């Protein structure tokens, strides 16, 4: 199912600041119940292709490609830091005729952006669904999941990051399949490869993202402070219904379950998967989001 071109034929484009962003939108401009799906690294809105159909009968579903990723525009200055993504994503939020409140569904760096957007736009949030998410700064390279303890310091956050990612597409060719339980069809793999076909700066988003991970003591301090701030808000957010979709065995999920154990007003459902759990349990994730929306209403 689902070529890259079939998925992106369903998506529209919108000008955003000095560039353009691609996004899925099941109901352009409608102010009915609305859900926004945010992917992370190194994926795109394609990641949600099998989840969204379970939610669409209840809600307008939007799923943007983050700037520099999917079919969204590439930036000539190739500056793809968290604050740069948040600039373009915030403008996108203001450009797609959203209703007064929305539910955010987010994954990985999509949750970093989504949690931050929510923290800055608190009266626009009717619920948050998060999975394999960025819920806290990390204490050190020790609190990272075991399969990546060495991958993140050495290599990507090093001088060697450029050659592994920009030249040999390490995040797409190695990391992505390494945290999916099944093996992707080459159709699905080509859909993930398409935004980063050309070697060089086109792949810079997949290298800047691991360099943004908030490691206390290392940095970056600006992301560390963004994450601490929205963690503080989330941990006392009694009025914001939350659904944590726990991946078993997961990647970040074990650590997230601990960070969020006492978060008020958070329900947990568990599904099978590693980090990219949408590729192993999209049906269960979609039906859990559908249940969550019905509880909100």
Numbering used by the authors: 11 to 307
Authors' description from the paper:
The light-producing reaction catalysed by the Renilla-type luciferase is one of the most widely used biochemical reactions in molecular and cell biology research. Here we track the role of dynamics in evolution, starting from the evolvable and thermostable ancestral protein AncHLD-RLuc which catalyses both dehalogenase and luciferase reactions. The regions encompassing the L9-α4 fragment and L14 loop are important structural elements that line the main access tunnels connecting the buried active site to the surrounding solvent. We conclude that the LUC activity benefits from conformational dynamics of the protein’s rigid scaffold to allow binding of a bulky substrate.
The most potent insertion variant, AncINS, has both an insertion and a substitution in the α4 helix. These mutations markedly improved substrate binding, linked to changes in dynamics of the cap domain, but not the putative catalytic pentad. The asymmetric unit of the crystal lattice of AncINS contains two monomers (chains A and B). Chain A has a structure similar to the AncHLD-RLuc template but features a π-helix bulge in the α4 helix where the L162 insertion and F163P substitution occurred. In AncINS chain B, the α4 helix is markedly distorted towards the α5 helix. In AncINS, the inserted L162 occupies the same position as the bulky F162 in AncHLD-RLuc, making the active site cavity of AncINS bigger than that of AncHLD-RLuc. The F163P substitution in AncINS disrupts the α4 helix because proline acts as a helix breaker, introducing a kink into the polypeptide backbone. The resulting distortion closes the main access tunnel in the chain B of AncINS. By contrast, we detected conformational flexibility of AncINS, accompanied by 1000-fold faster binding, based on determined k+1 and k-1. The HDX-MS profiles show that AncINS was deuterated more rapidly overall than the template AncHLD-RLuc, and that the modification of its α4 helix backbone leads to greater solvation and more pronounced dynamics, particularly in the cap domain region.
